[PDB]
């Protein structure tokens, strides 16, 4: 093998050829870069600002719950009803979450008393947008931080917050407002059904919150929330509670998508 | 030192040299002392390395040392996330076993290129005799060959083969077959005489494995085992440096280019990755993803598969390879060294000229009778034909009426063999015309006589005479002839005819051929009745003053297709060299006959005589040709050999040791040559091994040649070599069109991961859909260019310079990668941004989005219409950019394969669909792409989404572009071959 020195005199050809070829290659390269940019400029000239062209990965919305303390392979909310500094990291994550939901952070929206599709087609709101409809803290009533700023957590009957994934123009149906219904996945043979109580009544989401018209058309629009007051869960046991949305234009039977209309969370209420 | 010098020594100097006796043999003891000193008399079989360790390097190399580390990054990334409980990343277990499958199938794509792999020393143990017949302690018995030692006193007799290298002391009418040494199957007498300086020429040496034809002999063993002459031949055969083939070096060149390039790119972005903030257990999973993107996995496949679609085409024209690397070697070959006997020739003594009418007529020497016949209306000829037909003791065997006269089997020697066949061609039957003229007497060719002679009654009932026919050594046929046939008369033999005959028999004697006199005389009925008492050993018939009838001459003639084949190859710039063991003066004649030497070329020994000037005075340069004998070469330095090979372009070597064949062949290879060797005999093997391609004759080949050769012309039709050059130049020029197609796409495979690492935009192209582009969609289109026809008349091109013109040269790589691949990446990213923007995520949004994009814990990512997107709704769309970049590529790998059809022509000026296999690959490229795209189950299994129809169109100006960007370039070098557009942007 001997000795392998470098090839410094390997300027493959002469320093005039290399200024010649280089300024050619980049003259090629930038021309394409300006053609490619000409395309994305024609691309951002065919798009429409308030409505997406296609929602090809948004047939049925997702559903998401608070407090969100994750472990491996799913949601897990395993605290201490007695001990008070292991439900204060779940009580504060429901509070600071609602720190953009109060009547003052809801200064932008208007009261909707239509209880049907909030259909708008021209722009009347402050700064040429469409109106939204409020959702406030106190509407989860006993699971809003008042009269319960630990959200049922000291009393072994906590308050999760099921949150839908808003979609533009998305019609879930208008014969009914779609409800929450949290129950076990494995119904225990010796125990009872998960008897549960929703806020506001029935655990629905009002039909005046839809249609969503984009974050440009209803800029300050907020999702509606629910707060299931979970009563039954026995203490020192590990159950599984499924928090579905039943509706006309919604499903919850997607075995590749576990957070699509339903949100599965392990829950432990120790003593 | 091993130099057989025992032929020079005396009988007394011999019992001193082997402590033996001249009539007793050795002492029974000493025959074992030597056996336990020198080992047995056989051939040491050299094993190669085993059969599985040539699978072990096939899994290593420049593309194979990388695909071990990326399957070791994939099983240390299914290993640090399965002990922590993370079942979702079996995207790196599916990515480890599919790459080691690329290691071993590509390892099977480099091992299944060895068809025979037969041991060469298989056929050196089959030309050897099992038992000998020796004397020790003064008793004659029968022994195994492998029990003969240096000094053994052996007896030979004809029919058996010779059992050692044996100096002859007494021998009675003894003759051998030294084709295995000379390639020449003409008997060579042997005697107790020391008739040459060289032991390869002298008569008192008989060689192991030489078939002793007739007679007896006794002598002493002089060399044993591998020390014999035929044993030295075997040591050079197996024991050859297995230099890589031409294409092997070229394969390993661009492998080293890509192996260097894959290690810069991935490992300057490992410095980038840790230094724009990824951890190490992330930064190691960028190199892995880059190398899978940049390296063309199934390149090594498309290479070897292409080589097969040539090899089959070669086999269909009855040329079968033995390892695919050979299939190209011919087109890159500059120099062909050929045996003469049964390579260019027919190794079948046959008639060529016949002096009568004081003029030499040229006979027809072809195996199928195609060429130039001669003058058969001369009444002086039809007598000359009557003498040789009658005076002939050979015979055809029964049942060959459907056999060509040349290929028939004749009992006797090659002389009468030739004449008899000639007699079967000009005449209808040679045997029936010898029976209408029944024979009454005879004297066969004797050696006190030095001629043949027979006397017959006649076919004519009205003629009762007796006719005497005779043939012999031309000079002696004259001094027992006193009358002669010129044009129909008979004339006295004055001193003007005894000069015009001694003209012709020395004229054709300069063409190096067997010459034979012929004569006749009709015995009258007045002194020899039609039942006369002819008495042979009494010798009452005159045996002189006979009517001479004309010479005939015969030679080893060339094969039907050889002189045209030779011309075709020098027309492809190739230099041709004769390398034979035959005698010099047959060789030179044959060389000019086939066209190794061109009309007008001269030796220094041709010039010196036309000027009447001595040879030392000739200017060497002047000579177009030169001829060099076995002695001369051994007397030469190689320093003188190169000056010779330089000085004279048309070269002929002869009387060559098989040793010396190789020397020449490698003395060319040292001058940077790609060297072919065609051959047929045991003399040929070592220069068939060392040759960058060896070719052996399928039929007339001796096995040792065939098992040493890399290529086998089954039909011996030498003009096959020309078809193999054509397809080795074609495959060479058709491999670099396929590689560029495979290599350009490696750039749009690479650029996503780079961007994805730096700009933190979603992953545009996943390691799974990359492995499907490489290992399915563009396999068929890559190979379909092995069916492009040439653009220049390829057989008028000089053979390529094997230093300068390469398979993957610096310009080709840069043009496919940097320029075509750029446009392929600029369609792929134009489609990645329209699918992202038409479904919810705008351009700027992509920057820095990946960390929020690739997040299980966030099921709510609000896009550029505030829309919340679950991790599966997002990763489903990450699959709709896997599958929209993937089809931007596939749309540019159609315009690619159409601009990889032509290197110099326009696709316009030849055509678009002229290759019919190419247009069948494109419809499969398309339709495995829709199968993956649309088929149910494809989104979850193979990560492929049913994309929208507008997303096929987005990369279409970019493909119509790629075609016409190359279009303008191809014309641009046509109309101006000089200026900068040719000398930098050609590939
Ligand atoms: C576009 C900008 C950002 C990158 C510019 C980088 C320059 C230095 C790079 C990009 C393309 C490169 C060239 C691409 C192709 C070739 C042809 C080859 O036979 C020699 C190297 C050479 C000539 C490279 C030299 C270095 C090069 C000119
Ligand atoms: C637009 O209107 C909103 C009313 O909600 C106001 O708060 C905001 O300051 C206005 N901005 C501009 C740029 O006019
Ligand atoms: C439901 O919506 C449809 C709109 O297609 C409307 O025509 C219908 O009256 C609605 N029915 C009820 C019960 O709200
Ligand atoms: K690849
Ligand atoms: K032979
Ligand atoms: K070889
Ligand atoms: Mg031969």
Looking at the fold, whether B709 and B815 belong to one and the same domain comes out as no
CB B224 within 8 A of CB B150: yes
Q: What's the CA-to-centroid distance between A100 and ligand 6, angstroms?
A: 82
Chain B residue with CA closest to A51: the answer is B865
- Reduced to 3 states (helix: H, G, I; strand: E, B; else coil), residue B570 is helix
Q: Is B859 on the interface with A (CB under 8 A)?
A: yes
CA distance A36 to chain B (A): 6
Chain B residue with CA closest to A48: the answer is B838
- B844 Cβ neighbours under 8 A, 6+ residues apart: none
Looking at the fold, whether B581 and B527 belong to one and the same domain comes out as no
Alpha-carbon distance of A178 to A84, in angstroms, equals 35
Q: Is B395 on the interface with A (CB under 8 A)?
A: no
CA B947 to the chain's CA centroid: 52
| Rounded (to 5) percent helix, strand, coil in chain B | 45, 15, 45
Looking at the fold, whether B635 and B707 belong to one and the same domain comes out as yes
Tell the burial category of A228 from Cβ atoms under 10 Å away from its Cβ (0-12, 13-18, 19+).
Answer: buried
Count of beta carbons in the 10 Å neighbourhood of residue A30: 11
- The DSSP H or E segment spanning B675 is strand B675-679
CA B229 to the chain's CA centroid: 26
DSSP state of B858: -
Looking at the fold, whether B785 and B846 belong to one and the same domain comes out as yes
Looking at the fold, whether B430 and B547 belong to one and the same domain comes out as yes
CB B321 within 8 A of CB B710: yes
Sheet holding A179-184, edge to edge: A70-71, A74-80, A264-270, A238-246, A179-184
Task: Say yes or no for a CB contact (<8 Å) between A58 and B826.
Answer: no
CA atoms lying within 13 Å on the CB side of residue A105: 11
Q: Is B339 a catalytic residue?
A: yes
Alpha-carbon distance of B228 to B234, in angstroms, equals 10
CA distance B898 to chain A (A): 22
B:37-76 residues touching chain A, CB 8 A cutoff: none
CA distance B841 to chain A (A): 10
CB B367 within 8 A of CB B401: no
**B558 - beta bridge partners?**
B345
CB B710 within 8 A of CB B323: yes
Q: What's the CA-to-centroid distance between B17 and ligand 6, angstroms?
A: 40
H helical segments located in B516-652: 562-571, 584-594, 604-610, 630-634, 638-647
CB A184 within 8 A of CB A231: no
| Closest among B661, B664, B711 to B686, alpha carbons compared | B661
**B554 - beta bridge partners?**
B351, B514
**B219 - beta bridge partners?**
B154, B168
- Reduced to 3 states (helix: H, G, I; strand: E, B; else coil), residue B132 is strand
A11 CB less than 6 Å from ligand 1?
no
Tell the burial category of A269 from Cβ atoms under 10 Å away from its Cβ (0-12, 13-18, 19+).
Answer: buried
CA distance A146 to chain B (A): 27
Alpha-carbon distance of B604 to B621, in angstroms, equals 9
Q: Which chain B positions have a beta carbon within 8 Å of A167's beta carbon? A: 867-868
Alpha-carbon distance of B572 to B363, in angstroms, equals 31
Alpha-carbon distance of B51 to B48, in angstroms, equals 9
Question: Which CATH number belongs to the domain containing residue B629 in this structure?
Answer: 3.40.50.1000
Q: To what resolution in angstroms was this structure determined?
A: 4.3
Looking at the fold, whether B531 and B593 belong to one and the same domain comes out as no
Which tokens sit at B323? 């390892």
Q: Which residue reads 């119904």 in tokens?
A: A187
Residue nearest to atom 8 of ligand 2 (CA): A127
**Does the annotation place B751 within a ligand binding site?**
no
Q: Is residue B108 part of a domain?
A: no
Q: Which residue reads 């239509």 in tokens?
A: A114
Burial B618-634 (b: 16+ CB within 10 A, else e): beeeebbbbbbbbeebe
Q: Which chain B positions have a beta carbon within 8 Å of A260's beta carbon? A: 870, 872-873
CB B60 within 8 A of CB B181: no
A30 CB less than 6 Å from ligand 1?
no
Nearest-by-Cβ selection for A70 from B85, B819, B857 = B857
- Reduced to 3 states (helix: H, G, I; strand: E, B; else coil), residue B508 is helix
How far apart, in Å, do the first and last CA atoms of chain A sit? 75
DSSP state of B700: T
CB B616 within 8 A of CB B622: no
Q: Is residue B314 part of a domain?
A: no
Question: Which ligand sits closest to the CA of B341?
Answer: 7
Q: Which chain A positions have a beta carbon within 8 Å of B86's beta carbon? A: 72
Sheet holding A196-197, edge to edge: A63-66, A159-164, A225-230, A196-197
Calculate the CA dihedral of residues B164, B169, B172, B178 and round it to 10 degrees: 40
Enclosing domain of residue B197: 12-46+122-238
Burial A14-25 (b: 16+ CB within 10 A, else e): eeeeeeebeeee
Rg, chain B, Cα only: 38
CB B582 within 8 A of CB B513: no
Looking at the fold, whether B937 and B804 belong to one and the same domain comes out as yes
- B807 Cβ neighbours under 8 A, 6+ residues apart: B247, B250, B251, B253, B254, B732, B735, B736, B739
Count of beta carbons in the 10 Å neighbourhood of residue A29: 14
Alpha-carbon distance of B255 to B252, in angstroms, equals 5
> Which of B716, B739, B761 is the C-terminal boundary of a domain?
B716
| Closest among B211, B207, B206 to B192, alpha carbons compared | B206
Alpha-carbon distance of B20 to B13, in angstroms, equals 11
Looking at the fold, whether B689 and B759 belong to one and the same domain comes out as no
Q: Domain count of chain B?
A: 4
Nearest-by-Cβ selection for B834 from A43, A58, A61 = A43
Q: Which residue reads 């098989």 in tokens?
A: B658
Residue-by-residue DSSP string for B139-197:
EE--EEGGG--TT-EEEEEBTBBP-SEEEEEEEEEEEEE-HHHHS--S-EEE-SS---S
H helical segments located in B275-375: 280-294, 299-316
A114 CB less than 6 Å from ligand 3?
no
A200 CB less than 6 Å from ligand 2?
no
Q: What are the CA-CA distances from residue B525 to residues A123, B39, B530, B696 (Å)?
A: 143, 72, 6, 59
Question: Which CATH number belongs to the domain containing residue B500 in this structure?
Answer: 3.40.1110.10
Looking at the fold, whether B29 and B163 belong to one and the same domain comes out as yes
Q: What's the CA-to-centroid distance between A257 and ligand 4, angstroms?
A: 31
CA distance A87 to chain B (A): 20
The angle subtended at Cα B295 by Cα B292 and Cα B297, nearest 5°, is 80
Q: Is residue B176 part of a domain?
A: yes
**Does the annotation place B831 within a ligand binding site?**
no
Count of beta carbons in the 10 Å neighbourhood of residue B77: 20
Antiparallel, parallel or unpaired: β B514-523 and B552-555: antiparallel
Looking at the fold, whether B511 and B564 belong to one and the same domain comes out as no
Alpha-carbon distance of A239 to A267, in angstroms, equals 6
Beta strands in B414-568, from DSSP E residues, in sequence order: 451-456, 466-472, 481-484, 491-492, 514-523, 546-548, 552-555
- Reduced to 3 states (helix: H, G, I; strand: E, B; else coil), residue B843 is helix
Q: Which chain B positions have a beta carbon within 8 Å of A29's beta carbon? A: 822
CB B859 within 8 A of CB B852: no
Burial B778-797 (b: 16+ CB within 10 A, else e): bbbbbbbbbbbebbeebbee
Looking at the fold, whether B333 and B377 belong to one and the same domain comes out as no
Max Cα-Cα span within chain A: 89
A219 CB less than 6 Å from ligand 2?
no
| Closest among B737, B747, B741 to B896, alpha carbons compared | B741
Q: Is B982 on the interface with A (CB under 8 A)?
A: no
Alpha-carbon distance of B884 to B864, in angstroms, equals 21
Count of beta carbons in the 10 Å neighbourhood of residue B261: 16
CB B343 within 8 A of CB B698: no
Looking at the fold, whether B331 and B407 belong to one and the same domain comes out as no
> What are the two backbone dihedrals, phi and then psi, of residue A131, each rounded to the nearest 5 degrees?
-80, 160
A127 CB less than 6 Å from ligand 2?
yes
| Closest among B42, B191, B207, B43 to B131, alpha carbons compared | B42
Pocket test for ligand 2, best of A105, A107, A108, A126 (most atoms within 8 A of CB): A126
The angle subtended at Cα B250 by Cα B245 and Cα B255, nearest 5°, is 125
Alpha-carbon distance of B192 to B404, in angstroms, equals 42
> What are all long-range contacts of B96-103, with beta carbons under 8 Å and residues at least 24 apart?
B96/B71, B97/B71, B98/B771, B99/B67, B99/B70, B99/B71, B99/B74, B99/B292, B99/B297, B100/B67, B100/B68, B100/B71, B102/B67, B102/B297, B102/B298, B102/B775, B103/B59, B103/B64, B103/B67, B103/B68, B103/B71
Question: Which CATH number belongs to the domain containing residue B778 in this structure?
Answer: 1.20.1110.10
Q: Which chain B positions have a beta carbon within 8 Å of A168's beta carbon? A: 865-867
> Which of B716, B750, B777 is the C-terminal boundary of a domain?
B716
> Which of B215, B238, B261 is the C-terminal boundary of a domain?
B238
**Full 3-state SS string of B370-433:** CCCCCCCCCHHHHHHHHHHHHCCCCEECCCCCCCCCCCCCEECCHHHHHHHHHHHHHCCCCCHH
Interruption sites in chain A after residues (C→N beyond 2.5 Å) = none
Count of beta carbons in the 10 Å neighbourhood of residue B496: 8
- Reduced to 3 states (helix: H, G, I; strand: E, B; else coil), residue B913 is coil
Q: What's the CA-to-centroid distance between B124 and ligand 5, angstroms?
A: 13
The angle subtended at Cα B503 by Cα B499 and Cα B504, nearest 5°, is 130
Q: Is residue B410 part of a domain?
A: yes
Q: Which of A47, A51, A58, A161 has the highest number of chain B CBs within 10 A, making it the mutation to test binding with B?
A: A58
Nearest-by-Cβ selection for A256 from B842, B874, B940 = B940
- Reduced to 3 states (helix: H, G, I; strand: E, B; else coil), residue B365 is coil
Rg, chain A, Cα only: 27
Q: Is residue B191 part of a domain?
A: yes
Q: Which residue reads 């070229």 in tokens?
A: B250
- The DSSP H or E segment spanning B220 is strand B211-223
Q: What's the CA-to-centroid distance between B742 and ligand 3, angstroms?
A: 58
Alpha-carbon distance of A203 to A113, in angstroms, equals 18
Burial B50-62 (b: 16+ CB within 10 A, else e): eeeeeeeebbebb
Alpha-carbon distance of A271 to A86, in angstroms, equals 12
- B250 Cβ neighbours under 8 A, 6+ residues apart: B806, B807, B808
Antiparallel, parallel or unpaired: β B675-679 and B711-713: unpaired
- B314 Cβ neighbours under 8 A, 6+ residues apart: B320, B321, B327, B723, B724, B727
Q: What's the CA-to-centroid distance between B890 and ligand 1, angstroms?
A: 26
Q: Which of A29, A35, A41, A43 has the highest number of chain B CBs within 10 A, making it the mutation to test binding with B?
A: A43
Residue-by-residue DSSP string for chain A:
-------TT--SS-HHHHHHHHHHHHHHHHHHHHHHHHHHHHHHHH--SSS-S--TT-SS--EEEES--EETTEEEEEEESS-SSSSHHHHHHHHTGGGG-STTTTSS-B-----S-----S--STTS----B---SGGGGGGSSSS-TTTTTTTT--EEEEEE---BT----SSS--EEEEEESS--SSS----EE-SSGGGB--GGG--B--TTTSTT----EEEEEE----TT-EEEEEEEEE-SS-----TT-TTSS--EEEEEEE-
Alpha-carbon distance of B213 to B177, in angstroms, equals 7
Alpha-carbon distance of B105 to B63, in angstroms, equals 13
How far apart, in Å, do the first and last CA atoms of chain B sit? 55
Alpha-carbon distance of B446 to B296, in angstroms, equals 76
Q: Of B6, B146, B152, B339, which one is the catalytic site residue? A: B339
| Closest among B2, B233, B6 to B127, alpha carbons compared | B233
CA atoms lying within 13 Å on the CB side of residue B978: 0
């Amino acid at each position: 093998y001997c000795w392998n020195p470098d090839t410094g005199q390997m300027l493959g050809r002469t320093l005039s050829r290399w200024v010649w070829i280089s300024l050619y290659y980049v003259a090629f390269y930038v021309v394409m870069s300006g053609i490619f940019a000409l395309c994305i400029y024609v691309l951002m000239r065919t798009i429409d600002p308030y409505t997406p062209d296609y929602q090809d990965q948004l047939k049925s919305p997702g559903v998401t719950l608070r407090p969100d303390v994750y472990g491996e392979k799913g949601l897990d909310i395993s605290y201490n009803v007695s001990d008070s500094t292991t439900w204060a990291g779940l009580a504060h994550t429901l509070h600071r979450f609602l720190a953009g939901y109060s009547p003052a952070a809801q200064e932008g929206s208007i009261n909707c008393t239509s209880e049907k599709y909030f259909f708008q087609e021209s722009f009347l709101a402050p700064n040429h947008t469409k109106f939204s409809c409020k959702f406030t803290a106190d509407m989860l009533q006993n699971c809003s931080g008042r009269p319960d700023p630990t959200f049922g957590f000291a009393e072994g009957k906590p308050c999760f917050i099921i949150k839908m994934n808003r979609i533009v123009k998305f019609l879930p149906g208008n014969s009914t407002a779609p409800r929450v219904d949290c129950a076990f996945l494995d119904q225990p043979r010796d125990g009872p059904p998960l008897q549960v109580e929703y806020f506001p009544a029935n655990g629905t989401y009002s039909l005046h919150y839809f249609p969503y018209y984009g974050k440009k058309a209803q800029p300050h629009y907020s999702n509606p929330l629910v707060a299931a007051k979970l009563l039954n869960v026995p203490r020192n046991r590990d159950v599984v509670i499924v928090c579905k949305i039943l509706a006309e234009h919604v499903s919850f039977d997607n075995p590749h998508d576990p957070y699509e209309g339903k949100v599965e969370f392990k829950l432990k209420i120790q003593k | 030192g091993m130099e057989i010098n025992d032929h020079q020594l005396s009988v007394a100097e011999l019992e001193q040299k082997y402590q033996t006796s001249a009539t007793k043999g050795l002492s029974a003891s000493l025959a074992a002392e030597l056996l336990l000193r020198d080992g047995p008399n056989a051939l040491r079989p050299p094993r190669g390395t085993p059969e599985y360790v040539k699978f072990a390097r096939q899994l290593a190399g420049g593309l194979q040392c990388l695909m071990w580390v990326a399957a070791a990054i994939c099983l240390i990334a299914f290993a640090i996330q399965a002990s922590e409980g993370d079942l979702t990343t079996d995207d790196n277990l599916y990515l480890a076993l599919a790459l080691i499958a690329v290691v071993v199938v590509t390892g099977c794509f480099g091992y299944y290129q060895e068809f025979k792999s037969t041991n060469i020393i298989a056929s050196f143990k089959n030309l050897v005799p099992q038992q000998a017949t020796v004397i020790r302690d003064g008793d004659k018995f029968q022994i195994n060959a492998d029990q003969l030692v240096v000094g053994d006193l052996v007896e030979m007799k004809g029919g058996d083969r010779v059992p050692a290298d044996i100096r002859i002391l007494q021998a009675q009418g003894c003759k051998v077959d030294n084709s295995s040494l000379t390639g020449e199957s003409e008997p060579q007498t042997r005697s107790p005489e020391c008739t040459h300086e060289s032991p390869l020429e002298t008569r008192n040496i008989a060689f192991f494995s030489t078939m002793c034809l007739e007679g007896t002999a006794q002598g002493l063993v002089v060399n044993t085992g591998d020390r014999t002459i035929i044993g030295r031949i075997a040591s050079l055969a197996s024991g050859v440096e297995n230099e890589k083939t031409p294409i092997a070096i070229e394969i390993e060149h661009f492998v080293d280019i890509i192996a260097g390039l894959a290690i810069l790119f991935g490992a300057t972005f490992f410095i980038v990755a840790m230094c724009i903030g990824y951890t190490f257990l992330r930064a190691m999973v960028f190199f892995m993803a880059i190398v899978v993107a940049y390296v063309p996995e199934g390149l090594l496949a498309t290479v070897t598969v292409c080589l097969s679609l040539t090899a089959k085409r070669l086999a269909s024209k009855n040329c079968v390879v033995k390892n695919l690397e050979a299939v190209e070697t011919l087109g890159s070959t500059s120099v062909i060294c050929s045996d003469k006997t049964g390579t260019l020739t027919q190794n079948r003594m046959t008639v060529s000229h016949l002096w009568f009418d004081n003029h030499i007529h040229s006979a027809d020497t072809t195996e199928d009778q195609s060429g130039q016949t001669f003058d058969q209306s001369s009444e002086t000829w039809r007598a000359l034909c009557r003498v040789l037909t009658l005076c002939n003791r050979a015979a055809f065997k029964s049942g060959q009426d459907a056999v060509p006269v040349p290929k028939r089997i004749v009992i006797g020697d090659a002389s009468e063999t030739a004449l008899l066949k000639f007699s079967e061609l000009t005449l209808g039957n040679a045997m029936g015309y010898r029976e209408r003229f029944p024979k009454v007497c005879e004297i066969p060719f004797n050696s006190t006589n030095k001629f043949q002679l027979s006397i017959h009654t006649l076919e004519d009932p009205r003629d009762p005479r007796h006719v005497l026919v005779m043939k012999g050594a031309p000079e002696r046929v004259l001094e027992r002839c006193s009358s002669i046939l010129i044009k129909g008369q008979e004339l006295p033999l004055d001193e003007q005819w005894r000069e015009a005959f001694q003209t012709a028999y020395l004229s054709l004697g300069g063409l190096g051929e067997r010459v034979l006199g012929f004569c006749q005389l009709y015995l009258s009925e007045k002194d020899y009745p039609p039942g006369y008492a002819f008495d042979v050993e009494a010798m009452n018939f005159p045996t002189s003053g006979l009517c001479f009838a004309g010479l005939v001459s015969m030679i080893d003639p060339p094969r039907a297709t050889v002189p045209d084949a030779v011309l075709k190859c020098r027309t492809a710039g190739i230099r041709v060299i004769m390398v034979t063991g035959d005698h010099p003066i047959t060789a030179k004649a044959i060389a000019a006959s086939v066209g190794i030497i061109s009309e007008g070329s001269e030796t220094v020994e041709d010039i010196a005589a036309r000027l009447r000037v001595p040879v030392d005075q000739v200017n060497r340069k002047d000579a177009r040709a030169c001829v060099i004998n076995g002695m001369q070469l051994k007397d030469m330095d190689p320093s003188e050999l190169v000056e010779a090979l330089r000085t004279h372009p048309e070269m002929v070597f002869a009387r060559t040791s098989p040793q010396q064949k190789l020397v020449i062949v490698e003395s060319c290879q040292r001058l940077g040559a790609i060297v072919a060797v065609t051959g047929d005999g045991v003399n040929d093997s070592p220069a068939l091994k060392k040759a960058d391609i060896g070719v052996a004759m399928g039929i007339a080949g001796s096995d040792a040649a065939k098992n040493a050769a890399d290529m086998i012309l089954l039909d011996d039709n030498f003009a096959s070599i020309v078809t193999g050059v054509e397809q080795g130049r074609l495959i060479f020029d058709n491999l670099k069109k396929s590689i560029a197609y495979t290599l350009t796409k490696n750039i749009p495979e690479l650029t996503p991961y780079l961007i994805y690492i730096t700009v933190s935009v979603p992953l545009p192209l996943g390691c799974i859909t990359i492995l499907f582009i490489e290992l399915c969609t563009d396999i068929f289109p890559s190979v379909s260019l092995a069916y492009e026809k040439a653009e220049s008349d390829i057989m008028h091109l000089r053979p390529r310079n094997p230093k300068r013109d390469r398979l993957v040269n610096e310009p080709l790589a840069a043009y496919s990668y940097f320029q075509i691949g750029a446009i392929q990446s600029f369609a792929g990213f134009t489609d990645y941004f329209t699918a992202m923007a038409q479904e919810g995520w705008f351009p700027l949004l992509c920057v820095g989005l990946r960390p929020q994009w690739e997040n299980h814990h966030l099921q709510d990512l609000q896009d550029s219409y505030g829309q919340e997107w679950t991790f599966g709704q997002r990763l489903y769309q990450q699959y709709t950019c896997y599958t929209v970049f993937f089809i931007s590529i596939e749309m540019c790998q159609i315009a690619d394969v159409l601009i990889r059809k032509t290197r110099r022509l326009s696709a316009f000026q030849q055509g678009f669909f002229r290759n019919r296999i190419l247009v069948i690959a494109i419809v499969f490229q398309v339709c495995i792409g829709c199968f993956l795209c649309y088929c149910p189950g494809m989104p979850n299994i193979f990560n492929f989404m049913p994309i929208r129809f507008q997303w096929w169109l987005v990369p279409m100006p970019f493909s119509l572009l790629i075609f016409v960007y190359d279009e303008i370039r191809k014309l641009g070098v046509r109309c101006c071959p000089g200026s900068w557009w040719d000398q930098e942007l050609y590939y």
